[PDB]
Point group: C2
């Protein structure tokens, strides 16, 4: 049960590569300054609405999550749905959210393995800018459970868009 995290630079390069810049793998440093980086965020459920389904598969969750920086001051919210695709022996979900910050907003899509996140694996979603500073940009977001014993769960988050 070993964490395997991903740092911002690494995530920034992947965002830059997926974006189209092959300059990225060569020059790690050059990626970041061009890219939009959000580090040291925590995300947690402010409100969850579960629509269960027999045995879990199809179960839908509408959520509103809050982004806190390193002081515990809100930076934005994420709003969206999660659908349960599998239960056993790993729980899997589909996620789609729109995150609104001061600067603007972006969208997040992905397929998360919850079970793996609880064994401290980092998970990834695709990010796409929607408005403001983020418009036209695209990226990735990493999700990591700080401590699996704590409920409600809290997540460490990074987002890079290029």
């Amino acid at each position: 049960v070993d964490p395997g995290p991903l740092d911002v630079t690494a995530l920034a390069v992947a965002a830059a590569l997926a974006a189209g810049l092959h300059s990225a793998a060569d020059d790690p440093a050059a990626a970041l300054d061009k890219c939009i980086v959000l580090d040291e965020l925590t995300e947690f459920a402010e409100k969850l609405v579960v629509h269960d389904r027999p045995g879990g598969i199809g179960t839908t969750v509408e959520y509103v999550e809050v982004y806190e920086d390193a002081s515990g001051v809100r930076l934005g919210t994420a709003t969206g749905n999660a659908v349960v695709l599998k239960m056993e022996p790993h729980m899997w979900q589909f996620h789609q959210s729109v995150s609104e910050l001061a600067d603007g907003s972006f969208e997040a899509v992905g397929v998360i393995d919850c079970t793996a996140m609880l064994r401290r694996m980092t998970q990834v979603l695709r990010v796409t800018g929607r408005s403001g500073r983020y418009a036209g940009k695209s990226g990735f977001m990493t999700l990591a459970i700080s401590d699996p014993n704590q409920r409600p769960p809290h997540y460490s988050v990074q987002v890079v868009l290029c």
Copy 2:
């Protein structure tokens, strides 16, 4: 060291969701019939050109992979690159590939924890059609390693495209 897996129906729903309808969330049979499904695929390298960089980070890989069915007959090839992002404690890579079958072609992009794949975890990429029947469709593909000790590795693969 425990999986992990994600079945094809569950995958088709994720594909259908991201693609479009929320009908997919509930009624899965609908997704499956509407969408394109490649199952029972085995993938391995026909050739690998590694361009190392000191310490691993930025090690670029160029590859031609081959898709076999359950009869060990080729269905297509995947031609791509991989860029190492992090080595420790987990190895991560960015992958981007064009895959060519008879029917058409599609692209695949994502960020794989290689290490977790050796704990027999399923990894997921985002897929997009490019040619032929696949054109204009979208989805996901999964990867898992059959035997972590087996060398070179063989990956079990599914692709669903909606």
